[PDB]
Design a protein around this ligand. Structure first.
Ligand SMILES: CCCCCCCC/C=C\CCCCCCCC(=O)O[C@@H](COC(=O)CCCCCCCCCCCCCCC)COP(=O)([O-])OCC[N+](C)(C)C
Ligand SMILES: CCCCCCCC/C=C\CCCCCCCC(=O)O[C@@H](COC(=O)CCCCCCCCCCCCCCC)COP(=O)([O-])OCC[N+](C)(C)C
Ligand SMILES: CO/C1=C/C(C)=C\[C@@H](C)[C@@H](O)[C@H](C)C/C(C)=C/C=C/[C@H](OC)[C@@H]([C@@H](C)[C@@H](O)[C@H](C)[C@@]2(O)C[C@@H](O)[C@H](C)[C@@H](C(C)C)O2)OC1=O
Ligand SMILES: CO/C1=C\C(C)=C/[C@@H](C)[C@@H](O)[C@H](C)C/C(C)=C\C=C\[C@H](OC)[C@@H]([C@@H](C)[C@@H](O)[C@H](C)[C@@]2(O)C[C@@H](O)[C@H](C)[C@@H](C(C)C)O2)OC1=O
Ligand SMILES: CO/C1=C\C(C)=C\[C@@H](C)[C@@H](O)[C@H](C)C/C(C)=C/C=C\[C@H](OC)[C@@H]([C@@H](C)[C@@H](O)[C@H](C)[C@@]2(O)C[C@@H](O)[C@H](C)[C@@H](C(C)C)O2)OC1=O
Ligand SMILES: CO/C1=C\C(C)=C\[C@@H](C)[C@@H](O)[C@H](C)C/C(C)=C/C=C\[C@H](OC)[C@@H]([C@@H](C)[C@@H](O)[C@H](C)[C@@]2(O)C[C@@H](O)[C@H](C)[C@@H](C(C)C)O2)OC1=O
Ligand SMILES: COP(=O)(O)OP(=O)(O)OCC[C@H](C)CC/C=C(/C)CC/C=C(\C)CC/C=C(\C)CCC=C(C)C
Ligand SMILES: CCCCCCCC/C=C\CCCCCCCC(=O)O
Ligand SMILES: CC(=O)N[C@@H]1[C@@H](O)[C@H](O)[C@@H](CO)O[C@H]1O
Ligand SMILES: CC(=O)N[C@@H]1[C@@H](O)[C@H](O)[C@@H](CO)O[C@H]1O
Ligand SMILES: *[C@@H]1O[C@H](CO)[C@@H](O)[C@H](O)[C@H]1NC(C)=O
Ligand SMILES: *[C@@H]1O[C@H](CO)[C@@H](O)[C@H](O)[C@H]1NC(C)=O
Ligand SMILES: *[C@@H]1O[C@H](CO)[C@@H](O)[C@H](O)[C@H]1NC(C)=O
Lengths: 46, 65, 61, 151, 52, 384, 73, 151, 151, 150, 150, 150
């Protein structure tokens, strides 16, 4: 009577794809933003 | 010149700081119980024996400098 | 509390657990998880086993 | 009544991204225009206190994100509904990424607007009028975060 | 392996696993949890679950 | 002369470094006769020697605030105290020898009789330094005291702006530049420092585990949403007085704006900047005093890691600890506590006690266009 | 109680402080130095003895430091 | 009748993406064509206030996204159907990414147009004629976002 | 008859892509071939209004996508079959990616055309005859989206 | 209480409040530290008045170390999934908004100390821009406080 | 005790405490080691004094050694999932904050010894900014000892 | 014993200790070895004096070989999952820290031998920097021996 399954919720493909395609949509938006401020090129001789 | 000059102010601090560490371990202070691996008081004085022979060892560096 | 467990030999066979077995005829909802996995005395009339076909019959009266 | 246990994840990501993406816009408006102060001030020292208007107008962008990052963080309860937490997610992106654009525009037109005032002082009343249009992009995104999050 | 799912209810909304044969069905049932195994039950307990 | 070494001492507070900071400075003022005989040295002895009296007052003040919270090289002292007593915990709570296993970190109880009596005559009691929940007490204390020092130093700065008008004889500037400024600060922020003082005296450990929070009730003043059973009210009639204290501050924005320019296009738009740099600036100035809590925490945490990782491996040795081990441990410790814990922490706390005067104190009264006197004299020609 | 003791021992300087001051040219600075030292240092003590008065927590102690200061206090 | 729990995600995304991508287009129109005002200012400073036309054209792009971020956020209920929220996802994308394109076209023509007006004053009637064509790209996305949000 | 609850995702994603991808092609042909107006304006200012054809012909690209995206948004219906909704995703890709690429060729030939007409005015009937062949490409995607959406 | 993997998102808020904040404090020190090395060959007297962008950027690491201490002291066994997501958003909003304030100090403090060598009037103006560039790291702190008390 | 895979996150914090801190200690030694060569052809007397910015980067490596020894001595088969998540965040916050601290040392130590060749007065100012970029690795030490030992 | 897939993570610690220390030793002998060729045209005397960056880059390769033999001799059919996680992190700790140390040797050893072509006073200073880039591989060794021999 032992060895019951781990109880994944029924909406597991929804919550997996809501987290995955946001946290790599907010990481690519973060990486592209911090890439442009790192390489700013203000112009500095004077 | 400066390595001879920096050594005396470190030794003058080395005798002041480590003597007071010797007296604070002789009185068996309750704040310093992390450094101890009536019987426990004897370990405290042992560290005070340890500190003092290094506090006196900084006097030799003062005379050498 | 424990799952339903049918056996024909000394070895055990098909076994089935649920947390809320509930049925409805028309619009009357009747919960049956208190008569199934706790009562320990089920009417498993023909619970077949053949290693390629198995049936689990639960009857409630 | 009470939502699921994962439901407050999306409302927290609307609270952080309303401050992360709006500080990343206000950092571009401060850095790109503030380097324009360092090049202008070598030849015209009298205009170092009138040219800090593009760095105070990019500082309102981070205030636009801080207000709704607090306002989202007060509507956070244990077990909020999944509908109520997507509103905080949709309010955080619509003010962070909107203030990221508003801080990128203020940095560009604030940089050129103070490179040009060192050669033409009549530009300075026109530089404010473009810095007003580039600032209300953070204000337009604010009043969508005020409408979305308060439902 | 065994099966396990969270909703094996009837009354088809999008993806409910128990579908009736004719749609005006008088019977409806609902499992808020579910775990069944056949053909490899060993030592009176479930195996690893092939989840739904 | 007082408040700048005092704001240096709240964020750099240590009795051990309070000794080293003034002993470096007493050496620079008692031996200053032979140093003016020399022409010049490096700027680590030219700029430092030009401020030899600033560092002297930073030493004697950080001995005091390095005694309020005990923190002497992250070690603490007993002067007639330790009011938290562990022995009644073993007696009345029926709390036997089980300490060994089970729970190895055990928390005391203040509501049971005998454990806490008297709030330790002078300063912070040293039971916290040997506790492991030390930081969750200090962060409730050092943060709320960074606003108490942040309001009464900024209310003192707006009280010096009244005499900038009544001496120059500009009584028009009082009724839109001092009176609505002191109403806007006392109703919002001067109520906050008496809301911090209220929670210290009202609630004790016996009653009110459901204690209110001062972060929520301050935000729920601005956001008018009142009524929720999560956070109980601090006192009776809180919805009556706090709705009054916010609406008296809301009318201060038209009181500063609409009633000054009646003397026109540039005194309405450019002098609205004088309101909005005070409107949203006063909130961002109060929160800017949290940097004397962050620097007080980062200095107190750096003092542990040079003791419990550098000194402790030289101390916690059984037989030969104080011999040839501790002579080279302390000589590397004295280099690490000077180069890190006294030079950069003494310079990070130097600037952020200085920028709190330039921006958060000298913006309320100090305008400062200025022109220096520079009298014609031969004091340029001293010796060379 | 030290709260009714230290309110006048830090209240001596700042009230009897400007009463005994020499007539030199540093009167407007030393009185400012004595009063502000009494205001800053006493209020620093005041907001520290009030934090521990009526407390809410207890010191979470290590297990070797459960039985140790029973002999020391 | 009732929608699922996750159904409100796609409609609060179209509320944000109507404001995020239209402010990202209005900021490109303000930055790229505000760089050109500082180039024409150093030689021809009478045409400063008359050359704010390419940045008031990009300001209408920002309020195209503000209107349908209000039309979507006021049409939100808990448990809206999955069809009714998919309508307001494409109503947010077809006006954000149309105003994003129409802001790239305003900022490029507005950059070359006000720099060519400094050397040829007869171009100002032509630049303001191209900016009508580059502004109705955000308007064609607006009248397809209103026809999707209302149903 | 009633399809799945996510069936109307693919039709709105075709109504969005019919307007988004056409507005990107219409903004390329306006910005690229409007940059070419300001280069020929300085020396040959009488050919300004005659050379606005490559921003007119790039504007008909956007009204090809507006016609399809209105027909998809009007043929939308609660509970559409999964067959009918993919017919309007293929109708959105047929006129979306067509107007994206046909609006690219109006930009490149229009920018190269108005600079080669201002020096050789005999190339004006040769420029407009290449732009016609790049504009019927946007109409091949239109009249195959009218077949698919009304199928 | 909560599940066993609930304490992962809270220690990813204690780490990312120190990783992403010491990365912003490193960029403000490195990009402006080359501003001191290029300036001082011309004007070697301002190496004590001009290290104030380095000292200002040394507070972004301290603003993150403070939040990484409030999170790592509120960690106990069995925190809920709700209370652990609050400490993840309190660690990103003070780390990634300290990465923003470390950019705007490192770019302004680089060019600001070149322009102070050629003209000493900029010192009042350069220090004013570093006020507006440092409060981005402070606004992330007071939203990390309002999340971590819940 | 905990699950079988629970020791994966604690050893990954024992490796990343040494991997990412040696990657910062190498960039502080490699980037400031090319600055010794460009300094050498002008001022040969400043050779032994310019080994200080690679000494400071050498302490970044032992900041990660005293956390990787500390984790790999407290390892046990069957540690809980909570205790091993604490040591993953103890190695990520001392490695990636020593990678940032070693980045800023290699940049101000490279440019600092370029300006020391043209002017010897920068050497007391270069050694000040090397301290402020060193404590970013020390701030990651004191948040690693909080997370690991608790 | 353990599961059947358990020996995968120990083999990927035996091979990652080798192929990441051989990539560090590749960059050590190739980037410094291309500086020996540019030094040789004007100073052909100190050719044998300049194999020291190439010799000390080969020490990094035998640091990874010792751990990879030590891991591959501690393998059994059916080890625990805890033991094979120990040797994965023992392979990354000497592989990816030898890749950092071998990158640092190849950079300063390249500029060092091009600096001793024009001034031989750098030679006693070039070797003293390379010991600091040598011990980063040695620190990765003594954490790999601690992790694997548990
Ligand atoms: C690349 C991007 C990677 C993103 C990858 C993401 C993978 C996707 C994760 C989703 C997992 C399944 C969803 C789910 O329902 O599980 C859980 C949802 O709990 C969550 O929602 C957790 C999501 C938080 C992710 C944040 C990580 C970013 C940190 C970055 C910071 C770094 C800074 C470091 C410096 C709920 O558990 P359950 O089992 O469904 O509940 C049923 C059990 N019960 C019945 C007992 C209750
Ligand atoms: C830079 C890296 C920064 C770190 C950034 C990391 C970003 C990645 C974020 C992923 C978050 C997903 C976790 C989650 O959602 O919870 C899920 C589980 O929870 C866990 O089991 C936690 C696993 C976290 C693994 C991340 C470690 C990588 C670091 C390696 C670095 C070493 C480098 C050394 C060189 C819930 O999902 P589930 O289906 O419900 O599972 C339940 C089933 N179970 C009970 C059997 C478990
Ligand atoms: C204060 O008003 C402003 C308002 C703002 C922020 C937003 C909305 C109103 C706008 O987003 C809406 C959408 C568009 C619209 C209608 C704006 C009017 C703008 C103002 O007015 C043009 C100009 C103003 C500078 C402009 O007015 C010039 C003074 C001018 O008068 C000079 C004329 O030579 C110029 C040709 C003429 C044209 C441009 C309208 O206006 O700025 C402004 O900040
Ligand atoms: C004012 O905006 C104009 C139209 C706008 C706002 C709106 C949408 C419907 C439009 O968005 C779409 C693009 C309409 C469309 C697809 C063509 C409409 C074209 C007009 O009809 C040629 C020309 C054109 C008449 C005119 O602009 C030029 C004066 C000119 O006529 C001068 C001629 O000498 C030149 C030869 C001629 C070309 C067209 C033959 O261009 O403009 C406009 O009125
Ligand atoms: C190469 O062998 C040396 C160290 C090695 C190999 C270290 C590692 C293996 C690792 O085990 C150690 C732990 C790395 C480490 C923590 C070194 C600390 C200090 C030493 O002490 C300054 C210098 C020091 C004695 C000396 O090399 C420098 C030449 C010098 O110190 C002396 C003077 O020229 C110069 C004036 C001084 C400056 C900057 C004041 O730098 O390490 C050595 O020598
Ligand atoms: C067999 O391959 C050689 C070494 C190999 C492959 C070693 C591996 C087993 C490796 O695992 C390591 C690197 C073992 C090791 C550390 C050898 C060190 C030096 C070698 O010596 C023993 C040199 C050395 C004799 C010689 O090659 C140089 C000419 C020189 O003798 C001349 C001196 O001017 C020079 C300064 C001195 C320095 C470079 C050591 O070495 O050679 C070799 O042949
Ligand atoms: O001790 P504990 O830790 O137990 O908690 P506590 O609650 O008892 O007390 C500690 C709390 C402290 C006493 C409160 C001090 C901490 C702060 C973060 C307050 C400083 C911030 C200010 C003044 C700005 C606040 C932000 C806003 C008002 C947002 C602006 C919004 C609008 C203008 C609409
Ligand atoms: C759930 C939301 C995740 C997806 C959101 C994506 C939106 C992207 C928004 C902005 C990214 C653009 C930032 C790059 C700035 C460009 C700089 C430049 O071109 O000068
Ligand atoms: C104990 C009990 O009720 N057993 C019943 C039996 O009487 C019935 O005949 C059978 C189906 O025919 O189902 C079972
Ligand atoms: C461990 C396992 O898989 N055992 C199964 C059983 C099953 O009854 C039999 C025939 O189906 O085949 C075996 O392989
Ligand atoms: C199940 O097994 C037990 C134990 O051998 C046996 O007593 C029982 O009769 C079996 N069940 C049936 C239905 O035969
Ligand atoms: C689920 O089970 C609980 C008790 O186990 C019961 O009270 C409840 O009615 C069940 N749900 C339904 C829908 O019957
Ligand atoms: C098992 O039983 C089923 C149903 O009675 C039958 O169809 C099948 O042939 C049987 N198989 C064997 C191997 O007896």
């Amino acid at each position: 009577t032992y060895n019951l399954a781990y109880k994944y919720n029924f909406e597991y493909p929804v919550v997996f794809n809501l987290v995955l395609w946001i946290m790599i949509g907010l990481a690519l938006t973060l990486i592209v933003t911090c890439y442009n401020i790192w390489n700013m090129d203000p112009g500095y001789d004077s | 010149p400066k390595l001879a000059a920096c050594g005396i102010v470190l030794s003058a601090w080395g005798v002041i700081m480590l003597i007071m560490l010797g007296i604070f371990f002789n009185v068996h202070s309750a704040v310093l119980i992390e450094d101890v691996p009536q019987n426990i008081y004897n370990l405290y004085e042992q560290v005070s024996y340890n500190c003092f022979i290094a506090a006196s060892l900084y006097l030799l560096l003062g005379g050498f400098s | 509390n424990v799952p339903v467990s049918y056996n024909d030999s000394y070895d055990t066979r098909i076994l089935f657990w649920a947390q809320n077995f509930s049925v409805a005829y028309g619009e009357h909802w009747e919960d049956l998880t208190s008569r199934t996995f706790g009562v320990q005395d089920l009417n498993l009339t023909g619970s077949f086993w053949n290693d390629t076909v198995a049936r689990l019959v639960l009857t409630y009266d | 009544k009470n939502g699921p246990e994962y439901a407050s994840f999306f409302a927290v990501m609307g609270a952080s991204a309303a401050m992360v993406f709006s500080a990343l816009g206000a950092a571009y408006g401060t850095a790109k225009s503030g380097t324009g102060i360092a090049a202008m001030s070598v030849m015209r020292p009298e205009m170092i206190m009138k040219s800090i208007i593009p760095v105070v107008m990019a500082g309102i962008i981070a205030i636009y994100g801080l207000v709704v990052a607090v306002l989202i963080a007060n509507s956070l309860n244990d077990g909020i509904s999944l509908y109520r937490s997507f509103l905080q997610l949709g309010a955080g992106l619509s003010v962070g990424l909107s203030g990221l654009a508003a801080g990128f525009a203020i940095g560009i037109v604030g940089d050129a607007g103070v490179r040009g005032t060192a050669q033409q002082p009549r530009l300075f009343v026109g530089m404010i009028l473009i810095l007003i249009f580039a600032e209300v992009l953070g204000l337009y995104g604010l009043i969508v975060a005020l409408i979305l999050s308060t439902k | 392996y065994s099966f396990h799912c969270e909703h094996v209810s009837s009354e088809n909304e999008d993806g409910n696993l128990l579908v009736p044969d004719t749609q005006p069905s008088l019977w409806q049932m609902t499992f808020r949890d579910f775990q069944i195994q056949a053909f490899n039950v060993t030592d009176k307990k479930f195996s690893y679950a092939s989840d739904c | 002369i007082i408040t700048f070494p005092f704001l240096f001492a709240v964020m750099f507070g240590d009795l051990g470094h309070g000794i080293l900071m003034t002993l470096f400075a007493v050496w620079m003022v008692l031996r200053e006769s032979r140093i003016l005989s020399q022409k010049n040295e490096n700027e680590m002895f030219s700029t430092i020697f030009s401020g030899r009296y600033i560092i002297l007052l930073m030493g004697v003040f950080s001995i005091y605030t390095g005694l309020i919270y005990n923190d002497c090289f992250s070690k603490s002292l007993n002067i007639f105290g330790s009011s938290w007593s562990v022995r009644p915990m073993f007696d009345i709570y029926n709390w036997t020898e089980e300490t060994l296993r089970g729970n190895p970190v055990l928390q005391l109880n203040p509501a049971v009789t005998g454990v806490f009596g008297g709030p330790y005559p002078f300063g912070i009691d040293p039971i916290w330094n040997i506790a492991t929940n030390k930081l969750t007490f200090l962060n409730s204390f050092k943060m709320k005291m960074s606003v108490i020092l942040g309001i009464i130093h900024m209310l003192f700065g707006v009280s010096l702006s009244l005499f900038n008008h009544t001496y120059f004889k500009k009584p028009l500037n009082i009724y839109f530049g001092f009176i609505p400024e002191i109403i806007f600060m006392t109703s919002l922020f001067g109520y906050l420092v008496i809301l911090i003082f209220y929670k210290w005296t009202a609630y004790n450990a016996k009653t009110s585990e459901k204690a209110p929070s001062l972060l929520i009730h301050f935000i729920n003043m601005f956001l008018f949403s009142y009524g929720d059973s999560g956070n109980s009210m601090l006192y009776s009639g809180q919805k009556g007085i706090q709705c009054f204290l916010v609406v008296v501050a809301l009318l201060c924005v038209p009181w500063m704006l609409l009633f000054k320019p009646l003397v026109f296009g540039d005194t309405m738009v450019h002098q609205a900047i004088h309101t909005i740099e005070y409107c949203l600036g006063c909130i961002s100035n109060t929160a800017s005093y949290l940097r004397l809590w962050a620097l007080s925490l980062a200095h107190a945490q750096l003092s542990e890691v040079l003791w419990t990782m550098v000194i402790h491996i030289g101390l916690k040795v059984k037989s030969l600890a104080g011999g040839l081990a501790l002579f080279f441990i302390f000589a590397a410790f004295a280099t690490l506590t000077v180069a890190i814990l006294l030079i950069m922490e003494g310079l990070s706390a130097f600037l952020h006690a200085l920028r709190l005067h330039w921006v958060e104190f000298q913006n309320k009264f100090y305008s400062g266009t200025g022109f220096k006197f520079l009298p014609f004299s031969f004091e340029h020609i001293r010796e060379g | 109680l030290p709260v009714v003791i230290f309110t006048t021992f830090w209240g001596l300087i700042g009230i009897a402080g400007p009463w005994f001051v020499p007539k030199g040219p540093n009167r407007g600075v030393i009185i400012t130095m004595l009063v502000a030292t009494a205001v800053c240092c006493y209020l620093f003590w005041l907001i520290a003895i009030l934090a521990q008065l009526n407390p809410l927590f207890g010191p979470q102690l290590k297990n070797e430091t459960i039985w140790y200061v029973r002999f020391l206090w």
